Write a protein that binds this ligand. Structure first.
Ligand SMILES: CC(C)S[C@@H]1O[C@H](CO)[C@H](O)[C@H](O)[C@H]1O
Ligand SMILES: CC(C)S[C@@H]1O[C@H](CO)[C@H](O)[C@H](O)[C@H]1O
Ligand SMILES: [Mg+2]
Ligand SMILES: [Mg+2]
Ligand SMILES: [Mg+2]
Ligand SMILES: [Mg+2]
Ligand SMILES: [Mg+2]
Ligand SMILES: [Mg+2]
Ligand code: NA
Ligand code: NA
Ligand code: NA
Ligand code: NA
Ligand code: NA
Ligand code: NA
Ligand code: NA
Lengths: 1011, 204, 193
């Protein structure tokens, strides 16, 4: 029948979808959510054999174990066990686009399990098996007899095994196909894997059973009263003595209860549902659920007899909350939300796409600790535990259908085809039937990148009809089609329009006011965090806060989808597209997270945490105004600490308890701040601390911070003229300046400071030269490739302009003797085949104090692409352990991503000045620096810098971080100016104009001296 | 033009039409009809089917049509004749002046139906004036209302021709038969004859 | 697979629906709506045999004509030919309401036709067969090979016979089931045929 090549068949004998069941036979266990003996896990060791195609699977396998088989852990993805390679492709399908057909060479995973089943399970009731996740299609056999078939890799497939099992030993046989017609709807941008990757279990239910139940909560105007409505459905024989009791609990207190026999209200001319009943419970002053305060109640559904005998019980956590769009605003419990979200794929560097509780909790804790209050299930229903954790820890969730046909041409070819409506509908309807009772889920999504088809309109209406308590969104086809309640563009910029034909991405501010538009706008994807990115992140938040209808978005994305491989010595390294022989592939485009695969934070995470702060501050004189962006909670676990320092030197500090009502303000009057004597800039730094531990954070957690420049005292005092006078020694090839124990050497042929001495020690390994390039970041590269160059990408423009090949041509080099110093004057011309790109004019003034003042003035040809940087660089012979600087830190920060960084005195080990991005590039920069210290050296001024053991050349020529080798000495890059990193997206130029080095003429000055 | 979908005998009537498991089968009865007949000028209205209550599958397919063919209104009588799945209030056998307040699915006087709080759609009966045998009494009352009220734009009489079948007796003479005359049981006897004309098209 | 008891399977290898086609190879013919040499009718005398259930149909019927079969006119309803009784019920289904199942005693109509096909039709292009209406479900075979399946009694089911036909004589075998899961969606108040 080749059911895996027929979108008409998505399953055979599969049971109806429903909310999480456990079939408790004890009500107390149901109330407290304790384990159930009726729900058994089949996870553990299974037998597995790999085949090139289903036609190659031997028939004997159905009856007994294949001696060729291996014993492997389940759940798992077989690529992670080395049976075949995982494939990383973004848009292009991993198989030939010829729907509904798949390759004849279809990797087949043969799973089998021999397990015991107690007679008591077969004597009565129904025994079903549950496969929470099988990628991508499979046939099931039990004791040699065919049971069924199932598709959709991200939702559970359940089959009744009651007539197939026998007391004692039993054997299951599962033939999993990597490719199926379902694969045409699973083209998400992630590693393409397969296998039984989610839990497998057996559920026992009585013949007369609770087959489904829906919980809804409505409120009065001020949410002081609510009515909980629970519709319960049963299967089995109807008897007049049957009853259903729904009880609601707050802790160990029962706040409400309702009981009734089956038989719903009349719905039409034929009557009503005799196998259903709806209980309605009134709840006065319910504690409301929100990501701010995840208040939860427990609802227990009991099927029983009138005399009180329990048959079975089910239950769920209930969060009292109302979600609705009113007057163009997405409201929660009547308040306008501000979505601080992120897209999160289910990924593990070691286990692939298998999810575990520990990794989930770690992600949720890191998310809340970094001020995120929402997550988008990009782009498929998640492992069931995920919603339970979100309900309890408090996170707004966008549950998304497992539907993406990105690789089709046009994108909606299948979604606008009625022959694919059936397949698509099951991916939407079964998701809703499974997760509709979770309060964390506040918005339904029809899928991702599948254009806009009539099938979307139909499924949009289906959801609105069955679940009016949640808005429905979908980005495909222009982000504002008739299939979405929310304008949800991906990568729409703040101010810049991107007028693409048919599917334009308007500036978000402009999008809201288009003629006739009234919906709220929330980006389903924005701020693509590939590598050194998130430039311009603050521009989004300034806009979100100023415009009521701009209610936020979900960053793309949470974690790098890198995988682990080992070298010959067993040392692990991070691998990306193409490292497994997978081809074609999309290389590093699988890594766009705010954190590395092992959850180590990327510098960008801190910029997100700061911009997403819940308290806003303003300063006027001695008054600090604290404004709360919380909607429901008072600041009952917040303390404001303030500090005033002069160039990093603390003068005064204190703390004040925060007592701000949600949306409210608090004025804090700072005490008389004593004026400092010494010259310098005074800085005020405030931070909000949470004294007490929470379910998601430890005592002392910092949730917000901000700085302001206070008074500044310009230094006018003249340095006590040192008696010493430097001396110049001139030769044909050099200008040497001696001063006591120090010496400076300027090659007269190159025009650069080629060497320095402190005693008999050389300080340089490479001459101090101008630098106008940087090892390209992911954003500089875009989608450009050697086989497919993107002439528009920054890196390609720089390459074509000769920026990386530019040769320095000495125009002038003179030496003058002053009354108390030596003055070196140089001028260089950087040209590329007749074209002068840059001109550098410098002066070096060495006085008796041993200080070397360098003045640099650069001209950049207006017709050459704006350079990545304007600075100097050299390889220092020294290799010290610490790096001390007075500037923005402590973390890596760039011009368009430095709002989170604070000005102060920072000191870190040299290794922390390097950011280990899997794909190497310019990194570790620190801006707004007035003083830098390393070994015996000190540089002062107003510059940006990065310092490490890797040269820009090596970073540029190395594809993977683990392949980097520390060079001799230390490479120092000091920039007067550095281009922004961009990030609005990573496939087109995204560095905003105000962060491009287009001034034409630049000036910066540095003072180099030995401590 | 109406989709071949009627589940009248289910209890309740929408048991299948509100079940997502049946959405696939239903959608094909609707979509393939539209793909076949959309170029015919005579077809001015699409119908989702008949007597199958009102289920979520109806809302889905209603929207599908509006999306693929905005040139024709979409109607459906199930679930009360004025649900979210119909552009036209299309009751069957709603009377002119007399209300019939059935629970959940009332049949209001058509004059009254039009002005219920918030209602603005036109009203056209998908079925009215049941012509079983000696019938059509009160037919003129309907037309008087149709002509007086702009939004009462008519209706479709039920129905055109008697569904009687021919059988033969001893003398080989043919005679008109109805339910039960073929041993078919259970049956609904003469209820298959409600036309304005006899099976051979002779007028009643 | 008992495809007639699965609302998940409404057809097998059926071609997409579309507006009326005639495939004129002459524009003036298309303009004037005159008969097309590319659209042939297979209406007329066919071979028919009645069986109480699909399990009672002999396999030999796929390869050659059943001598016990009768020659009947098609299109037609077999109740009108007297093979079994037409049923008149209004609301109540004519079969036990147990979706998606139908009675095991499922009247099965076995239709067959020996017809000729011009070689020019097989030397190029695509030759399809169109059943404008089959009540209520059916399987199709051509020259003994299974072609497809289809449901919905009131719309045309089309199948590509290009790879099943030979120049000259060919034999179609059509097994029509009276009841199917499609029957749960066809409870209109009218005679059940
Ligand atoms: C490569 C672009 C043309 S499509 C772009 O690629 C990104 C890679 O992280 C993401 O998958 C986005 O969702 C997708 O739209
Ligand atoms: C028998 C009624 C309660 S239902 C009534 O029966 C009529 C018989 O001609 C028609 O079929 C109507 O459409 C139907 O609603
Ligand atoms: Mg399939
Ligand atoms: Mg995509
Ligand atoms: Mg646990
Ligand atoms: Mg700031
Ligand atoms: Mg079927
Ligand atoms: Mg009816
Ligand atoms: Na809403
Ligand atoms: Na806003
Ligand atoms: Na990606
Ligand atoms: Na507090
Ligand atoms: Na690199
Ligand atoms: Na009128
Ligand atoms: Na009738």
């Amino acid at each position: 029948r080749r059911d895996w090549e027929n979108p008409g068949v998505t399953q055979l004998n599969r049971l109806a979808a429903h909310p999480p069941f456990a079939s408790w036979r004890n009500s107390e266990e149901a109330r407290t959510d304790r384990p159930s003996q009726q729900l058994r896990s089949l996870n553990g060791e299974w037998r597995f054999a790999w085949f090139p195609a289903p036609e190659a699977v031997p028939e004997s396998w159905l009856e007994c174990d294949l001696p060729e088989a291996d014993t492997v852990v389940v759940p798992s993805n077989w690529q992670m066990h080395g049976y075949d390679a995982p494939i990383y492709t973004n848009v292009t399908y991993p198989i030939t686009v010829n729907p509904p057909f798949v390759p004849t060479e279809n990797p087949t995973g043969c799973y089998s399990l021999t397990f015991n089943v107690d007679e008591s399970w077969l004597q009565e009731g129904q025994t079903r098996i549950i496969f929470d996740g099988v990628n991508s299609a499979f046939h099931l056999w039990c004791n040699g007899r065919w049971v069924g078939y199932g598709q959709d890799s991200r939702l559970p497939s359940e089959f009744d095994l009651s007539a197939f099992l026998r007391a004692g030993e039993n054997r299951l046989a599962v033939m999993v196909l990597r490719w199926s017609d379902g694969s045409y709807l699973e083209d998400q941008d992630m590693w393409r894997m397969s296998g039984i990757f989610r839990d497998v279990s057996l559920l026992h239910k009585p013949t007369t059973q609770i087959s489904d139940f829906h919980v809804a909560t409505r409120f009065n105007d001020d949410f002081s009263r609510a009515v909980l409505e629970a519709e319960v459905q049963m299967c089995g024989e109807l008897r007049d003595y049957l009853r259903v009791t729904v009880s609601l609990w707050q802790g160990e207190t029962q706040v409400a209860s309702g009981t009734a026999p089956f038989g719903g209200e009349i719905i039409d001319e034929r009557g009503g549902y005799a196998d259903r009943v709806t209980l309605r419970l009134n709840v006065e002053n319910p504690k409301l659920w929100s990501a701010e305060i995840p208040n939860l109640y427990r609802a227990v559904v009991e099927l029983h007899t009138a005399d009180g005998t329990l048959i079975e019980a089910e239950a769920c956590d209930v969060g009292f909350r109302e979600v609705r769009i009113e007057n163009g605003l997405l409201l929660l419990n009547g308040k306008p939300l501000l979505i601080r979200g992120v897209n999160r794929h289910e990924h593990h560097p070691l286990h692939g796409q298998v999810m575990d509780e520990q990794t989930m909790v770690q992600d949720i804790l890191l998310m809340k600790q970094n001020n995120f209050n929402a997550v988008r299930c990009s782009h498929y229903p998640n492992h069931p535990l995920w919603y339970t954790l979100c309900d309890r820890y408090g996170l707004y969730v966008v549950d998304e259908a497992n539907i993406e046909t990105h690789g089709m041409v046009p994108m909606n070819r299948l979604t606008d085809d009625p022959r694919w409506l059936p397949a698509m509908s099951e991916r939407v309807t079964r998701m809703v039937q499974r997760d509709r009772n979770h309060p964390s889920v506040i918005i339904w999504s029809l899928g991702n990148e599948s254009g806009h088809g009539a099938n979307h309109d139909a499924l949009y209406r289906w959801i609105k009809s069955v679940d009016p308590s949640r808005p429905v969104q979908y980005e495909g086809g222009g982000a504002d089609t008739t299939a979405t309640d929310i304008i949800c563009p991906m990568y729409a910029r703040v101010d810049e329009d991107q007028p693409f034909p048919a599917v334009p991405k308007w500036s978000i501010k402009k999008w809201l006011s288009l003629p006739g538009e009234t919906r709220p706008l929330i980006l389903c994807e924005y701020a693509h965090a590939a590598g050194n990115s998130l430039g311009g992140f603050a521009k989004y938040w300034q806009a979100f806060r100023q415009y009521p209808r701009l209610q936020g978005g979900f960053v793309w994305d949470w974690v790098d989808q890198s995988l682990i491989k080992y070298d010959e010595n067993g040392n692990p390294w991070s691998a990306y597209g193409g490292d497994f022989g997978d081809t074609p592939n999309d290389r590093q485009f699988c890594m766009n997270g705010l954190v590395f695969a092992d959850r180590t934070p990327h510098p960008a995470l801190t910029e997100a945490k700061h911009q997403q702060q819940f308290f806003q501050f303003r300063l006027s004189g001695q008054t600090i105004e604290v404004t709360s962006e919380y909607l429901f909670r008072h600041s009952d676990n917040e303390l404001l600490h303030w500090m005033v320092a002069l160039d990093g030197k603390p003068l005064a500090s204190g703390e004040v308890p925060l007592d701000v009502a949600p949306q409210g303000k608090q004025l804090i009057e700072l005490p008389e701040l004593p004026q400092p004597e010494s010259a310098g800039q005074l800085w005020l730094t405030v931070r909000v601390v949470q004294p007490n531990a929470t379910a998601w954070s430890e005592a002392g957690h910092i949730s917000a911070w901000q700085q302001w420049r206070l008074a500044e005292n310009l230094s006018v005092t003249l340095p006590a003229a040192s008696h010493a006078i430097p001396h110049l020694t001139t030769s044909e090839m050099d200008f040497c300046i001696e001063l006591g124990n120090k010496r400076w050497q300027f090659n007269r042929q190159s025009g650069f400071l080629s060497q320095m001495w402190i005693g008999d020690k050389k300080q340089l390994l490479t001459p101090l030269r101008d630098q106008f390039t940087r090892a390209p970041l992911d954003n500089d590269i875009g989608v450009s490739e050697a086989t497919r160059i993107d002439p528009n990408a920054w890196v390609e423009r720089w390459k074509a302009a000769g920026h990386y090949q530019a040769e320095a041509a000495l125009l002038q080099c003179t030496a003058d003797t002053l009354a108390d110093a030596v003055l070196i004057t140089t001028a260089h011309a950087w040209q590329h085949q007749g074209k002068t790109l840059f001109i550098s004019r410098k002066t070096y003034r060495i006085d008796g104090s041993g200080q070397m003042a360098i003045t640099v003035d650069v001209e950049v040809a207006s017709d050459t692409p704006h350079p990545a940087r304007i600075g100097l660089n050299c390889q220092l012979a020294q290799v010290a352990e610490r790096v001390n600087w007075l500037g923005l830190g402590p973390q890596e920060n760039y011009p368009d991503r430095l709002t989170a960084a604070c000005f102060d005195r920072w000191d870190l080990p040299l290794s922390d000045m390097y950011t280990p991005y899997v794909f190497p590039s310019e990194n570790g920069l620190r801006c707004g620096t007035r003083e830098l210290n390393y070994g015996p050296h000190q540089w002062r001024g107003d510059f940006q810098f990065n310092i490490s053991r890797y040269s820009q050349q090596q970073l540029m020529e190395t594809s993977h971080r683990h392949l980097l080798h520390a060079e001799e000495g230390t490479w120092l890059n000091i920039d007067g100016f550095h281009m922004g990193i961009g990030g609005d997206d990573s496939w087109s130029p995204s560095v905003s104009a105000e962060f491009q080095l287009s001034a034409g003429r630049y000036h910066y000055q540095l003072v180099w001296c030995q401590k």
